Amino acid sequence: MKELSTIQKREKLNTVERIGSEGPGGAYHEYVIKSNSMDSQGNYDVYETIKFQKGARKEEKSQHGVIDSDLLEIVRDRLKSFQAGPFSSRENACALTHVEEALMWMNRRVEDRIERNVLGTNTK
Amino acid sequence: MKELSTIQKREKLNTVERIGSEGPGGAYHEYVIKSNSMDSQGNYDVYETIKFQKGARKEEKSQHGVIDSDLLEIVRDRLKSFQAGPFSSRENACALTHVEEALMWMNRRVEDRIERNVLGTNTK
Amino acid sequence: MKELSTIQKREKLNTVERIGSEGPGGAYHEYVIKSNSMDSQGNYDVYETIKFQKGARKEEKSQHGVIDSDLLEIVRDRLKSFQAGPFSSRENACALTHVEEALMWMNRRVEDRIERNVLGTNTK
Amino acid sequence: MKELSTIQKREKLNTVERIGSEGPGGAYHEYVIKSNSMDSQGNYDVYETIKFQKGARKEEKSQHGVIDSDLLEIVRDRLKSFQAGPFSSRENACALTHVEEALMWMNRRVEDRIERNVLGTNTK
Amino acid sequence: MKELSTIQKREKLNTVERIGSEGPGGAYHEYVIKSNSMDSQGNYDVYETIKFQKGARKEEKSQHGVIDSDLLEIVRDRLKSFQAGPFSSRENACALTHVEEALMWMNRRVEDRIERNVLGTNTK
Amino acid sequence: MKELSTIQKREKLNTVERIGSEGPGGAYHEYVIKSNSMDSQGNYDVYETIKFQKGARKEEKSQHGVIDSDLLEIVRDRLKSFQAGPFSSRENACALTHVEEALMWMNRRVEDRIERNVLGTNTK
Ligand SMILES: Nc1nc(=O)c2ncn([C@@H]3O[C@@H]4COP(=O)(O)O[C@H]5[C@@H](O)[C@H](n6cnc7c(N)ncnc76)O[C@@H]5COP(=O)(O)O[C@@H]3[C@@H]4O)c2[nH]1
Ligand SMILES: Nc1nc(=O)c2ncn([C@@H]3O[C@@H]4COP(=O)(O)O[C@H]5[C@@H](O)[C@H](n6cnc7c(N)ncnc76)O[C@@H]5COP(=O)(O)O[C@@H]3[C@@H]4O)c2[nH]1
Ligand SMILES: Nc1nc(=O)c2ncn([C@@H]3O[C@@H]4COP(=O)(O)O[C@H]5[C@@H](O)[C@H](n6cnc7c(N)ncnc76)O[C@@H]5COP(=O)(O)O[C@@H]3[C@@H]4O)c2[nH]1
Ligand SMILES: Nc1nc(=O)c2ncn([C@@H]3O[C@@H]4COP(=O)(O)O[C@H]5[C@@H](O)[C@H](n6cnc7c(N)ncnc76)O[C@@H]5COP(=O)(O)O[C@@H]3[C@@H]4O)c2[nH]1
Numbered sequence: 085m086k087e088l089s090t091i092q093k094r095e096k097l098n099t100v101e102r103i104g105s106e107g108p109g110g111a112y113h114e115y116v117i118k119s120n121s122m123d124s125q126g127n128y129d130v131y132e133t134i135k136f137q138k139g140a141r142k143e144e145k146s147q148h149g150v151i152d153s154d155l156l157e158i159v160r161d162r163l164k165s166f167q168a169g170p171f172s173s174r175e176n177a178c179a180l181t182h183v184e185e186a187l188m189w190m191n192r193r194v195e196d197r198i199e200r201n202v203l204g205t206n207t208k
Numbered sequence: 209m210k211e212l213s214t215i216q217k218r219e220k221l222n223t224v225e226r227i228g229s230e231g232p233g234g235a236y237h238e239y240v241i242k243s244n245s246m247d248s249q250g251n252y253d254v255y256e257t258i259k260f261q262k263g264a265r266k267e268e269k270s271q272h273g274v275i276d277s278d279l280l281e282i283v284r285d286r287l288k289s290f291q292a293g294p295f296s297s298r299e300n301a302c303a304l305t306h307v308e309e310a311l312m313w314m315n316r317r318v319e320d321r322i323e324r325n326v327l328g329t330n331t332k
Numbered sequence: 333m334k335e336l337s338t339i340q341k342r343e344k345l346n347t348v349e350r351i352g353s354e355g356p357g358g359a360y361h362e363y364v365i366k367s368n369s370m371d372s373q374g375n376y377d378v379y380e381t382i383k384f385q386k387g388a389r390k391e392e393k394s395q396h397g398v399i400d401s402d403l404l405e406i407v408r409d410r411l412k413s414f415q416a417g418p419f420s421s422r423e424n425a426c427a428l429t430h431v432e433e434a435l436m437w438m439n440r441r442v443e444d445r446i447e448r449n450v451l452g453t454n455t456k
Numbered sequence: 457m458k459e460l461s462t463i464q465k466r467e468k469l470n471t472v473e474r475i476g477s478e479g480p481g482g483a484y485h486e487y488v489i490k491s492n493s494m495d496s497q498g499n500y501d502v503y504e505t506i507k508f509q510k511g512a513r514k515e516e517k518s519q520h521g522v523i524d525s526d527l528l529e530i531v532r533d534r535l536k537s538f539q540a541g542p543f544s545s546r547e548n549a550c551a552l553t554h555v556e557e558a559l560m561w562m563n564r565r566v567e568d569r570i571e572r573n574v575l576g577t578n579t580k
Numbered sequence: 581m582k583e584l585s586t587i588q589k590r591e592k593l594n595t596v597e598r599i600g601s602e603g604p605g606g607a608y609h610e611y612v613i614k615s616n617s618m619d620s621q622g623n624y625d626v627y628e629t630i631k632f633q634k635g636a637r638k639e640e641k642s643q644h645g646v647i648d649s650d651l652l653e654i655v656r657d658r659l660k661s662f663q664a665g666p667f668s669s670r671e672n673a674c675a676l677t678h679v680e681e682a683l684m685w686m687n688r689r690v691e692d693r694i695e696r697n698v699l700g701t702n703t704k
Numbered sequence: 705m706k707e708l709s710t711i712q713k714r715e716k717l718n719t720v721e722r723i724g725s726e727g728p729g730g731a732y733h734e735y736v737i738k739s740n741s742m743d744s745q746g747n748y749d750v751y752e753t754i755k756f757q758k759g760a761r762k763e764e765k766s767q768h769g770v771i772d773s774d775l776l777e778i779v780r781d782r783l784k785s786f787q788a789g790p791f792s793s794r795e796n797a798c799a800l801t802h803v804e805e806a807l808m809w810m811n812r813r814v815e816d817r818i819e820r821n822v823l824g825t826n827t828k
């Protein structure tokens with residue numbers, strides 16, 4: 085189906101699913117994170133929807149939402165916090181460095197698209 | 209301020225804020241992503257809350273929520289989609305490799321923790 | 333020759349040679365590491381053959397042997413040992429991180445091939 | 457025990473064990489790779505030993521053996537061959553780049569040591 | 581135009597400009613660095629030209645000059661100094677690792693071109 | 705020794721030399737790059753000085769000059785050109801990616817300092 089195959093294979097808290105159809109650029113713009121667990125009453129402990137910006141912000145017709153950069157900045161902030169606290173680890177430091185370099189490349193993309201004046205249009 | 213200082217400085221679609229207080233491990237467990245734009249009535253175009261798992265999933269008193277690798281798996285899937293579509297870029301390729309290596313390091317944490325019998329406990 | 337061109341060009345303890353013919357996947361499955369030095373009597377100081385698994389382990393026809401992740405795990409263990417000991421270095425630290433990321437990618441390969449039910453088969 | 461905890465968790469062909477005790481720098485200098493499979497007589501399908509250089513090469517009393525870059529050069533050559541063949545993969549490319557960068561850092565160590573005149577000597 | 585589009589966008593000390601014509605390999609071989617500030621007289625605080633080797637050193641007619649690894653070695657030395665000094669930062673440490681790895685890859689290029697017996701020639 | 709211990713050891717075209725004294729932050733602010741070869745009168749074929757910014761630009765009293773990121777942007781531009789031309793190489797591609805990531809970390813430093821109000825001051 086549309087349940088994501090993840091790099092983590094054991095002890096997974098949640099599954100992630102694509103919602104809707106492929107949209108601009110070939111990607112999905114809505115996802116659900118839902119728990120692999122249940123309460124005693126049978127509903128999901130976790131059922132969170134994430135909508136991404138689909139179409140440009142400057143247009144009302146567009147689905148306004150989050151961008152990849154926001155999620156990574158959240159994860160970065162939490163990792164910096166965890167490293168400053170009592171349960172730090174070398175794995176956290178390595179993950180954090182990769183998260184920040186991914187963030188830098190995404191920012192490199194936005195800036196390149198500004199220089200070429202293509203930010204916000206459906207063009208390579 | 210609780211607004212996060214992000215790597216991206218220009219043309220930001222959204223602002224990210226920590227919500228609540230630092231808790232287990234020294235990290236925040238809820239964040240809000242909100243638009244830098246507003247609608248006619250003056251309401252936000254995007255006002256998205258993300259809640260993270262706080263406390264072990266087995267326990268009912270615990271706040272159940274997402275984990276960081278879910279967010280990165282979403283971003284990873286979207287980057288793979290974009291790279292297969294008409295708007296690919298070398299910047300995407302580098303961001304994607306870093307996102308996957310961050311995911312691989314996070315998995316390494318879970319596996320080390322399983323090996324040491326500390327998964328799900330407040331211990332290094 | 334079939335001697336391997338190495339990244340280290342100076343003060344090399346040993347030379348490495350490819351042994352045999354290429355086979356499955358375009359690769360060789362036996363190697364010899366021999367010292368660049370001879371003893372008081374003229375015999376080689378070091379002469380190791382390393383045989384790799386050739387064909388699936390589950391088939392009786394196969395040349396059973398080692399796989400690359402085994403060698404890398406040995407090197408990882410030795411580098412971690414050296415870093416915990418009195419002769420640590422930053423060069424060791426950089427090497428160690430790359431060896432671990434190579435292992436993580438080799439394992440990604442294994443997990444992908446299991447997911448697609450192709451592990452142990454001659455299929456891309 | 458002396459069994460190494462590896463990054464790979466599923467479908468492991470072999471196990472690696474440390475042999476003996478700590479030597480110079482805090483590392484072990486002999487390892488065994490043995491299959492997780494056995495023949496009819498209960499003998500190992502694979503049992504191979506790798507011995508590392510312990511003590512400087514010139515001193516003749518030293519335990520002469522392989523060095524880590526020899527193993528990494530083998531793995532690098534095999535990965536290059538696989539990438540040229542029909543069973544290539546992106547995981548192979550990422551692993552190969554990391555293996556090569558580990559080799560480049562191992563050479564850098566050697567070159568610094570030659571420069572500081574401390575090669576072959578038990579000195580940081 | 582002729583001005584380089586740089587990764588740094590705010591508080592830039594200087595501008596970098598391409599000088600002259602496209603040359604061997606498709607690159608430019610003269611660059612100019614000039615301050616974004618000017619003095620009381622209206623003259624530039626900085627106006628520095630860097631010429632690069634265009635053509636082989638052995639031939640007299642060719643423009644003798646610097647090579648890129650020279651510039652990176654200077655930056656590496658300065659970064660090592662700053663890391664030993666009071667104004668170190670994690671950003672400096674990451675930049676330094678990348679500069680050294682870029683240098684090592686430039687050294688791979690030199691070493692390979694030696695081995696294929698093409699160093700100093702206009703050949704792929 | 706004010707001469708630089710470089711990563712390339714063979715077939716070097718130029719030598720790089722420290723000029724002047726240790727300065728602010730513990731680093732050198734002038735360097736000379738000189739040809740290993742010779743002009744018939746005996747002057748060096750290449751002899752070029754690069755002076756770095758020492759002290760803040762606004763202060764007239766400072767030594768005005770180039771900054772490290774200027775040199776890396778030149779090298780980046782040359783690497784991108786070479787990769788678009790007939791003499792590309794995989795070594796160039798890796799070198800270029802590392803040069804861009806070093807530049808991004810240097811810009812990450814400038815921004816952090818701006819944020820904390822220390823840019824242009826002698827403080828972390
Ligand atoms: N102002 C602003 N700041 C940003 O940081 C930013 N990041 C993305 N966007 C814009 O959001 C809108 C929603 O994206 P959509 O999926 O509809 O189209 C996207 C998507 O189909 C595709 N694409 C390819 N790679 C990526 C990528 N890495 N991130 C986002 N979109 C990508 O290429 C289209 C145009 O991208 P941008 O040209 O970045 O403009 C987008 C677009 O206007 C931004 N707008
Ligand atoms: N089954 C399962 N699979 C996972 O992948 C996973 N990841 C986290 N958890 C558990 O979720 C719960 C919520 O985390 P909390 O913040 O309360 O405590 C966490 C947090 O305070 C801190 N910590 C340090 N680094 C990290 C990190 N990278 N990710 C998460 N938590 C981290 O260290 C505590 C214990 O961590 P785990 O020992 O992984 O167990 C956690 C915990 O039981 C998981 N549980
Ligand atoms: N159980 C198990 N766990 C492992 O970790 C593992 N790693 C490899 N193998 C299997 O060993 C046997 C020996 O490899 P051979 O060279 O004949 O064929 C290999 C080889 O020709 C080629 N190949 C391509 N890339 C690689 C690679 N990175 N490592 C090994 N083989 C590779 O692709 C074939 C199939 O690979 P796998 O599909 O991984 O199955 C192999 C095969 O059955 C494993 N088997
Ligand atoms: N000629 C030559 N070329 C090489 O590439 C090379 N690599 C290692 N050696 C020498 O092999 C001998 C066996 O190592 P031992 O474990 O006894 O001591 C080692 C070991 O205890 C420790 N050490 C710390 N980090 C490393 C490391 N990365 N690799 C090897 N040894 C290391 O630090 C000691 C001295 O290292 P070198 O100073 O390189 O000399 C060694 C030593 O004489 C080499 N000799």
Ligand SMILES: Nc1nc(=O)c2ncn([C@@H]3O[C@@H]4COP(=O)(O)O[C@H]5[C@@H](O)[C@H](n6cnc7c(N)ncnc76)O[C@@H]5COP(=O)(O)O[C@@H]3[C@@H]4O)c2[nH]1
Pocket residue numbers: 603604605606633634635636637647648689690693698699700701702703712715716717786791792796
């Ligand atoms: N002795 C010596 N040691 C070095 O480290 C070195 N690095 C470069 N050179 C030689 O300098 C001269 C000036 O370069 P030019 O632009 O004219 O030609 C270059 C240039 O057009 C192109 N090229 C492609 N990638 C690169 C690259 N990464 N660095 C330099 N030149 C490159 O490919 C041509 C041949 O390169 P080399 O084959 O390395 O020989 C060069 C050449 O003789 C060197 N010479």
Ligand SMILES: Nc1nc(=O)c2ncn([C@@H]3O[C@@H]4COP(=O)(O)O[C@H]5[C@@H](O)[C@H](n6cnc7c(N)ncnc76)O[C@@H]5COP(=O)(O)O[C@@H]3[C@@H]4O)c2[nH]1
Pocket residue numbers: 591592593662667668672727728729730731757758759760761771772813814817822823824825826827
């Ligand atoms: N406007 C502006 N844009 C820039 O990109 C920039 N980069 C540097 N500078 C300023 O140039 C001046 C010359 O540097 P100096 O060596 O005297 O002091 C420097 C130097 O001694 C030390 N330092 C530590 N790490 C670095 C580094 N990576 N690059 C440069 N200097 C560094 O820390 C001091 C303060 O650095 P900044 O706080 O960036 O301010 C510098 C300084 O005012 C800049 N000014």
